Design a protein around this ligand. Sequence first.
Ligand code: PHE
Ligand code: MG
Lengths: 29, 69, 143, 238, 165
Amino acid sequence: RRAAPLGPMPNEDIDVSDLERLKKYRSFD
Amino acid sequence: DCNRALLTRLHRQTYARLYPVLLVKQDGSTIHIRYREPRRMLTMPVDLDSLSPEERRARFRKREAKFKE
Amino acid sequence: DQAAKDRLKKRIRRLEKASQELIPIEDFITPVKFLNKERQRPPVELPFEESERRALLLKRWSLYKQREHEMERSAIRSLLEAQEEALQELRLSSPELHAEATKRDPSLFPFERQGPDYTPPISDYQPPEGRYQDITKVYTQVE
Amino acid sequence: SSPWRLLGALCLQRPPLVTKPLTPLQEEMADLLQQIEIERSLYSDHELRALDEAQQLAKKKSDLYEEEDEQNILLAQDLEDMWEQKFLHFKLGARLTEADKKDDRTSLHRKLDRNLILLVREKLGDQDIWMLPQSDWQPGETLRQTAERTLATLSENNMEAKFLGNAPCGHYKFKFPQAMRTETSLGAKVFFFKALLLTGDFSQAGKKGHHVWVSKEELGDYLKPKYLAQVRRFLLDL
Amino acid sequence: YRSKPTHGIGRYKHLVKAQEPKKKKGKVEVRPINLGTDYEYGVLNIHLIAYDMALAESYAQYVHNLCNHLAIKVEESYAMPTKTMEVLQLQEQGSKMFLDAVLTTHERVVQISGLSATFAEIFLEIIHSNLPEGVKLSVREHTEEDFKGRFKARPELEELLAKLN
RNA sequence: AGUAAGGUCAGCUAAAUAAGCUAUCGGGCCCAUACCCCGAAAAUGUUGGUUAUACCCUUCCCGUACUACCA
RNA sequence: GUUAAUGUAGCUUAAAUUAUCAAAGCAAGGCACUGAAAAUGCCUAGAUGAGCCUCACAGCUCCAUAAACACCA
Ligand SMILES: *C(=O)[C@@H](N)Cc1ccccc1
Ligand SMILES: [Mg+2]
């Protein structure tokens, strides 16, 4: 029985599709 | 903007010395090139083989007449 | 006979199942000619007066390099905007030609261009003769 | 149709022939880069022969017990002299040709380190205005082909020029003076296409009164402020 | 947990690509060559050929870095194997030759992905304008034949191929 | 059905150091043929995995083999 | 000249003598570092559009950007 989240999900802003277009972190700091 | 990349260096750690050598093409045009020997200028010889038999005969008579008087 | 053909076919497939080797770049592989051949420069002496002007000059080179990027980035920005604004403007007036101007037209590639030379080619020049041998150390391997 | 007249202009550009002079700042850094190359390098074969002379000369000074007095024939210093004499005797062309001295703005042998954009003079309304070559668009013909046709319409030309795809590179809209302005022809739309001049040049029939070649620095003088602005947008400074 | 509203808060496998590992038996450069989109050209190879190693690589780096700033995908920045030619000049008052010099050629290739049809004019304009000195720019299509030069020669197949024919 | 078990030159065997004999091809000896002497070529049933291969395992295929009983 | 939109660095924070410790963060560059990128080390450049108003809220105006009526071959 899936429930609805109470607010915005953390990583839902970024687009799953077209991964190459999004710039990566490239660093650990 | 033809001088935006020529200013560089041989990015290596164990490389032999290079010297500026002005190499002239088949025509009178020259391009600056680094070469092993400290020679000042070098010319590119003509590939006589590529010439056709009528073109080769044209180049055959020129040198023989030039060497003679 | 027919069995010999079978092995020839099989030998073809066996060699096919192997990796396609790539020629190593000898430019990035220094030969043993320079491998400790006593050809080491003496301990380099750096004048203090030379060091201060050398380092200070590099600071200006960093600033001057940024100047080149600024004008180049602005130049391509205007060139992109100029072409983009004309393409969209023409589309409203002439939709039929807009489709022709945007579709991939194989009229550009190949675009082989050479760089400028130090001196222009002189008139009536006769270079000497000779021949061009190509040593080009061959690399053939079998599996 | 439309009140505007469709025109296809050709922006023929000559690539530079010689490398542009180094700026004073670049000269100083070029010396530094070359200096670092020598410091971080090994001894070349010629530099080995420099010590080879030292090896033999030192024997000629103190160790006069050399086994073989034949040795070589030439010297490393002598070899450089051999190439130096040939180089000094040999002469090359001049970067600044006679066109620069005579300010012949028609020949292609001027400003070999710069870029020349073709300009022609056209008479419209009993007035001569220098402009880029252009032609009127025709049915069953793409706008790029209009610029392509303009190259073939030049007076006794053999030039071969590579174009740039099919998309345009600029635009310029002007309206006719109210004396001759009508609803049928309100004005015209000029579209510019860039091309690279590979080889070929105009004949000797007409040179001064037909076409000139100028750079972007002096491009404004032959043009007018309204037409000048749109041309400078797509012309990359070089 | 499924029923909790905080389900799937740890999802990450949809953020990174699958990154298929290079299997020992499946190791192969499977390149889906794209050809002829509406406004996107196919895979192109920017062949930069010059006689000097330092000058050829210096302009090769500029092309690769320029693409990144312009959001142009670069698949690889490999280098074509070098070719060495023995320059022989003719001797005057004679016919027998002599070894003049040894000149080599260095080629650097920056393979690029598809680009918008409008950007083709703009991108190439920057490249050919910045050719420093004698660098032979060559923007050709990425056919398998142009990519065959990077590999070695296989006389073992040529022995079979000749007999097959 | 199940289980067992094998494929190697044209052919048959032994080793995996792919050999030996014969057949096949070329030459010599003889009037000719065969014998004989000399020289050469020739293969691991199949797919995949065995550091990498081969003798191994796996897949495919051909063929071989035993058993199928108490009511 | 006139009619309609906008103007902290490349985007953007605080700020905008409204008060406070203060013009920030990320980009963008040079050099070094197997050969490309990327990391890492060292290191370079800097704006509060302009004035007025309010001096204890912040906006109007000017100028400029920029489109328009509109000079044009
Ligand atoms: C330019 O000012 C006009 N004279 C151009 C012209 C328009 C129409 C007919 C002839 C000339
Ligand atoms: Mg790097």
